[PDB]
Amino acid sequence: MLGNLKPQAPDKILALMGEFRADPRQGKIDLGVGVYKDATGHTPIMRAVHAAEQRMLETETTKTYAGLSGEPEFQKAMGELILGDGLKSETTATLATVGGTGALRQALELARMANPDLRVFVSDPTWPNHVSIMNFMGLPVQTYRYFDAETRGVDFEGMKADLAAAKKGDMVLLHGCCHNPTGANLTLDQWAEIASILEKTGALPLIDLAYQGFGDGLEEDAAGTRLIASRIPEVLIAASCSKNFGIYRERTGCLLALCADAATRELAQGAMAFLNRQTYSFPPFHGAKIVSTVLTTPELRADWMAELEAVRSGMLRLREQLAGELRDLSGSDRFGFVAEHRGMFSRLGATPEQVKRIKEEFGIYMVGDSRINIAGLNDNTIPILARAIIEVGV
């Protein structure tokens, strides 16, 4: 029977890593990495996190089944970290998921459960996993203009025009901050306008928030999300803890469902818990317990925020440098967007041909769409990348 299985395409990350590994070039560089890497090229375990695991090891007396939709401490701490004082517990449903991806999958299952004729609107471009899951679910997908290949910024007028075609009950997927893969983001004023279009169309916003604390700051990065929450009656937020906590493999995230009434909330929580139940019963405990420990323990929380800010500040300075080196070599602004972008990713606007030429002539590797990971740059690699970008004629 299993022989009738259709061949499924690999993870691709492997192919990139295999091509790169095969490269005999002593000076090859890898900007395709999708995780944070420090100056030495490592993805360290944050101090606060290692401190939480030591504490957990000393306090946990059992490992019996716990909360089906997560532990109260985690749900509460997450909603506060995301919505801040605006957290309206009375109308908020929460679900511990298996990473932000689990949160996205559940959110989609929830919405479709409420509206079978659900349509999803995704940005152009967006994280490929978005489309993958949606295709796998057989949901209709529409695209809305977003990245401007010429300016490397947001084509807002285009986005508005396309979003204007959403109907009541449709879903609009928005990256809360640090757009992956582009790095081009919305201003708080652009968020206000998007909010108006959403109220007008009656479309349901789904926010993919996986990089809170990597853009302009913990609070600053949630500004757009908070604006949507306060003006839109129903909002779905899929949050991740893999990156801003550095616990990728622990698989920790959560689905937040903001509802109009308390009755509607009771409904949503019941459907979410039911969803977890029908997929894998209980969500993973370890990673979520680390997070709630860091956030509830003053000492740890303070250390986490400090370490996270150090990371953010570092990448931002890497942006300033690359843009400066590019300013000098080009003798023009052109590449100024590099310093204007936020997140650990940036789309250079290079064509596939140029990307291939950069790799062959300079040994630098990046995703085929010209996406580079800022964290992979340093005092030694920046001059090389700059020269390569200019040399290939981007």
Ligand X SMILES: O=C(O)CCCc1cccs1
Ligand Y SMILES: *Cc1c(COP(=O)(O)O)cnc(C)c1O
Q: Write out the binding residues.
A: 34, 65, 127, 180, 371
Binding-site member from 94, 101, 212, 276 for ligand X (CB under 6 A)? 101
Binding mask 325-364 for a copy of itself (x = CB under 8 A): ----------------------------------------
208 contacts which partner out of a copy of itself, ligand Y, ligand X, none, CB within 5 to 8 A by kind?
ligand Y
- Mind telling me the catalytic residues? 127, 208, 210, 243
Q: Does the footprint of a copy of itself cover residue 249 (CB under 8 A)?
A: yes
CB of 266 to a copy of itself, least distance (A): 9
Q: Does the footprint of a copy of itself cover residue 70 (CB under 8 A)?
A: no
Rg (CA), the chain: 21
Among the listed residues 62, 46, 64, the one whose alpha carbon sits nearest the alpha carbon of residue 305: 46
DSSP one-letter string for 53-97: HHHHHHH--------BTB-HHHHHHHHHHHHGGG--GGGEEEEEE
Which is closer to a copy of itself, CB of 6 or CB of 298? 6
Binding-site member from 57, 59, 138, 298 for a copy of itself (CB under 8 A)? 57
Query: Which parts of this chain interact with ligand Y (CB under 6 A)?
Result: 34, 99-101, 127, 180, 208, 210, 240, 242-243, 248, 253, 281
Which tokens hold the place of 381? Answer: 């690699």
Q: Does the footprint of ligand X cover residue 13 (CB under 6 A)?
A: yes
For residues 358 and 344, give the distance between their C-alpha atoms in angstroms, rounded to a whole number: 20
For residues 393 and 218, give the distance between their C-alpha atoms in angstroms, rounded to a whole number: 37
4 contacts which partner out of ligand Y, a copy of itself, ligand X, none, CB within 5 to 8 A by kind?
a copy of itself
Residue 145 carries which side chain, given as an amino acid letter? R
CB of 277 to a copy of itself, least distance (A): 6
Instruction: Output the CA–CA distances (angstroms, integers) from residue 122 to 50, 159, 363, in the order listed.
Output: 37, 10, 33
CB of 40 to ligand Y, least distance (A): 23
Which tokens hold the place of 301? Answer: 């929380």
Q: Please give the helix or strand (H or E) that residue 111 lies within, else none.
A: helix 99-114
Binding mask 18-37 for a copy of itself (x = CB under 8 A): ---------------xxx--
8 A C-beta contact, residue 214 and residue 315: yes
Note the helical H segments in 282-336: 286-296, 298-330
Among the listed residues 206, 277, 286, the one whose alpha carbon sits nearest the alpha carbon of residue 239: 206
Binding site residue list for substrate: 34, 65, 127, 180, 371
Q: Does the footprint of a copy of itself cover residue 129 (CB under 8 A)?
A: yes
Q: Does the footprint of a copy of itself cover residue 248 (CB under 8 A)?
A: yes
For residues 125 and 136, give the distance between their C-alpha atoms in angstroms, rounded to a whole number: 19
Which is closer to ligand Y, CB of 34 or CB of 213? 34
Which parts of this chain interact with ligand X (CB under 6 A)? Answer: 13-14, 33-34, 101, 127, 129, 180, 281
